[PDB]
Subunit: 435 residues, 3 copies
């Protein structure tokens, strides 16, 4: 591929090319993208969306908005640092085409900021509850009216794909959604494939899929404009990742690992006695141990460790990207940047500690179990209303929850149930069940 | 038809005639009816029964008892003014028979006071939830054990017909229920027909039905004594309305229109800026503009407009009655009194604004949806216990909720679930669901 | 039967005999049993387990722990008093084998202390909900995969048998459970039979059953060591009760009769006047009338009557036991000790009043109805997770509720659901239901 094409400023529906050298640097398309997301209704709704991790009465624990905000700050740093090195490697990108190192920071930051925008509540358990509804619940009745891939979109409903829908969905008065730059949509697409075939290889980009059938035509346009390399020549389409999607992924990987740990310690789910032991290798060269011992509050000690460890992993991930830059550009890199880390054993240890103390904790399990009932109830009410829209009750349901082809109706129901705020979903659920 | 027979003082089971001229003026049968309703357990229970309209923590919103009381006051005025004009047009009713203008006010007031006594909770949505239970829910299993009209009583369960049952149902030690005058029972019956045929015409009197199969024999006796005109000779019975039922209907129509509007403004669902605009034509000939401007509080200004509009519509309704009095006596008036109003456009505008801002409001929809679940759960508990009364659990349900033919059992279950107070229904529902 | 064998100090797994004369007086096996129950997790859990009797905002009402404690105190007196008379009638028990009167008090106290340890919540209605689950609910699907007696253990699930399971269940690191002395396990077994045949006679010992199929081999060991007399002629096994089981029963009967009455008066469910009227014959010979009239508080007057009445019935039960000692030893006593009471008319009056004012009270019926839903919901969740342990949801359920053969799994599910504390059961129920 070519970096000039990968850094496309095209917005959906454009009729003429947007050259970087002609951009107003105070209205740079990539930076406009970031601000568009910040002010968007879907991003703002993350304020009222918790993570599956429990709340604390005494200490800070991230909601989904502040988690996404911090991921985007890590992403900006990754993009800035790699962008500087790319412009040194390929100086024509700056001298001829006018690209600057902050462009790469803005692309990665915007795609990272919006990564969780489409995820249902209750973490991956919420995805599994939606999928189960269509695999074995009421929604199984729709199988024979859908293509294999349309049905797969439902039984393996994917928040990454719903995020792509949220960013690009046309509505009356708003064609093309947020109309983000194609470079940003490219960096967003960690899994550039459809729902089938399912996990066709052990390649990182094949672990999930990244767009629904409803968004296939758009990503085809995005992939064409960017020049992404093909990974399939059948009607089951798939492409090699945009190089910057590796940085978006690394930002998420760094933040899932270290910031979950930080939250677990502040909640007390992870004993503070383990804080230094698990972070020593990651921070040992830079930690000022005398300073660490002088900090009097648990949360200040763990924030210092988190800052040091994120710094270490950012610097390393930049160097790993540049080492494998040609292979990434050629589509032959089959792993994540963090997979190559010299700290991979320590990262796995932290992740396993978080699985054991946070995600397997009673408070998380209880919430996932409750979430199954909440999501299954909302989906069933919407789907019965779709199937019998004439009855008095189902008209009330439509008025309460949602005031096209079968597939497009079903994927919209999933999309809308997934993006309801915590409070709205809970209130509507309680009314349907009379509580 | 003859007004001498329409004004019957007969009570259920009477052995001898009751002549108006022989009545004690301090114990007039029609006034005794008003007081019997006031002190009755069903009317007292309206204290603990809310309308579908939401509660407010700052302003007055009507419960069902206050609504019924104000309807009865408007009704008394309609009856008084019409009674005076009817006694001028038929002076023998006063000379030979001894009827006085207050008699007509008493009949209309008592019938109007009792109009909502049999309605289930949650408004018309509550009626629909009970019907759905027998149409498509657990109660569907009874269809093949019931006649067409018995089943129709259930799938189209009607609060008007339940009100007639509540007023007249014999119980051990209370033969004939409240034993109201037959004239009052006639004025109560807005839909003098059985559940089938369903809407045989577009006449307002055919829109619903007014008695269940369980009360058909009772209303036949009332219809015979009053000399109501038979409107159909098939096994399907129906009669032309008692003339005073047009005034009972008018009392409800005027209050439903204007007082919902008043509550909507005080709730903030309807902006105050709409209050004068929608009521100027109805009040302009009688309003004291100096008084209106001096009033500094919204609820006082709205209450003033409400009083003037109601007075306007009462006066117009009386004139409309008297214009079509002979048509009403002949059974050939196919319309409501308010349908002939010169302010029909303004009334329709007020009704539509109330639908848009009150009845389609989120708080009303939520409550109606919850009411479906509450009523369906209580009905299913009672019917499962009816079908299998020998189990330990169903014996507990019987002790908790209810400490004859299949049809008579099912209609009683509906009547009882419909008349439980809000708090008792909710408490029993929560216990059944373990909440 | 021989008292030397009936007073066995054997613990499960023992390879050598335990001679009473060799026991350390500060570590007597029978007294060790009492202390082992007190400190056991199942007994401690009765702290957080209420009776079906409603709680009071003004007066004392017993939780299950305090009820079991007071039953054990009454049992200790019964055992001590009968022990002294037994050692007079069989002096070789002391002189040759070294038994002392307090040994009999310790046996009866320990067995009585543990009588309610296995009962499910919600009283006998809780037992009926569990049985109904397997007779007609989801659990009916297991009938054809179980023997007749295995299925009867479920459809007639019995708290007495679950108590035996709780006391003796082997787990890794705790073989034989609490490892109680066999004399104590004999005194505990009021119904020495398996689930089938059901009520083979009207003998009190045949009213219920005392051990599940999972514990049949253990009680067979216990019966052999104690030398209990075989009572059943068929392949369904059954033994005559250990004589001390009659005293454990009498402690329960006396406390349930008088202390329930006491609680009902202090709750206000039973009018205060009924206290002296129903207890005057039980207390007349021993009551200090000036002490009683000087007492100014209801709870103190009633507590005085309770102490006097329990005193009377303890003394009488001891005399009844000794009067029929030889018939009990030979297995020919067909009644309970209290059945032979001279105060049986007063006991029956008190029980019937408690049934009418307490157990048939609205507050109890409400709680039993809710308990059906709670227990049925928990049983269905555990059984569906047993049937499909592979699904993501069922693996969450397994982590939340339970972090071998089909029968062994089902009886363990019943045992665990029955032994959950009130708050733990309610919390898990609410999460499964989304609240």
């Amino acid at each position: 591929a070519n970096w000039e094409h990968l850094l496309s400023l095209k917005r959906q529906g454009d009729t003429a090319k947007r050259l970087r050298i002609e951009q107003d640097d105070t209205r740079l398309g990539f930076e406009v993208d970031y601000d568009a997301i910040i002010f968007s209704a879907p991003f703002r709704s993350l304020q009222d969306k918790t993570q599956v991790i429990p709340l604390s009465k005494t200490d800070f624990v991230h909601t989904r908005l502040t988690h996404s905000l911090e991921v985007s700050v890590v992403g900006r740093s990754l993009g800035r640092m790699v962008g500087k090195k790319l412009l040194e490697k390929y100086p024509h990108l700056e001298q001829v085409y006018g690209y600057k190192f902050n462009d790469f920071g803005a692309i990665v930051a915007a795609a990272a900021l919006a990564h969780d925008i489409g995820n249902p509540p209750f973490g991956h358990s919420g995805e599994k509850a939606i999928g189960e509804f269509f695999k074995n619940g009421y929604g199984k009745r729709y199988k024979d009216s859908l293509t294999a891939k349309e049905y797969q979109d439902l039984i393996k409903f994917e928040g990454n794909a719903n995020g792509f829908k949220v960013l690009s969905q046309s509505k009356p008065g708003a064609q093309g959604g947020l109309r983000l730059s194609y470079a940003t949509l490219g960096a967003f697409m960690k899994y550039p494939k459809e729902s089938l075939p399912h996990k066709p290889s052990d390649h990182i980009a094949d672990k999930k899929y990244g767009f629904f059938q409803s968004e296939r035509a758009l990503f085809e346009d995005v992939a064409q404009e960017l020049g992404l390399l093909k990974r399939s020549t059948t009607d089951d389409v798939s492409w090699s990742r945009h190089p910057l999607a590796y940085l978006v992924e690394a930002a998420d990987d760094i933040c899932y690992t270290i910031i979950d740990f930080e939250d677990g310690i502040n909640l007390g789910l992870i004993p503070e006695e383990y804080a230094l032991e698990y972070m020593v290798k990651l921070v040992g060269q830079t930690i000022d141990r005398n300073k660490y011992n002088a900090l009097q509050e648990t949360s200040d000690r763990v924030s210092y460790l988190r800052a040091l460890a994120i710094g270490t992993l950012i610097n390393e991930s930049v160097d790993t990207f540049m080492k494998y830059e040609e292979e990434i550009l050629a589509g032959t890199f089959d792993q994540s940047l963090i997979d190559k880390s010299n700290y991979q054993a320590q990262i796995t240890d932290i992740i396993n500690l978080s699985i054991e103390r946070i995600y397997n904790s009673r408070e998380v399990i209880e919430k996932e179990i409750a979430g199954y009932e909440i999501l299954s109830t909302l989906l069933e009410a919407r789907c019965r209303a779709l199937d019998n829209n004439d009855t008095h009750y189902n008209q009330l349901i439509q008025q309460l929850l949602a005031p096209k082809s079968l597939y497009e109706n079903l994927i919209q129901i999933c999309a809308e149930v997934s993006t309801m705020t915590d409070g709205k979903a809970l209130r509507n659920y309680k009314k349907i069940k009379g509580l």
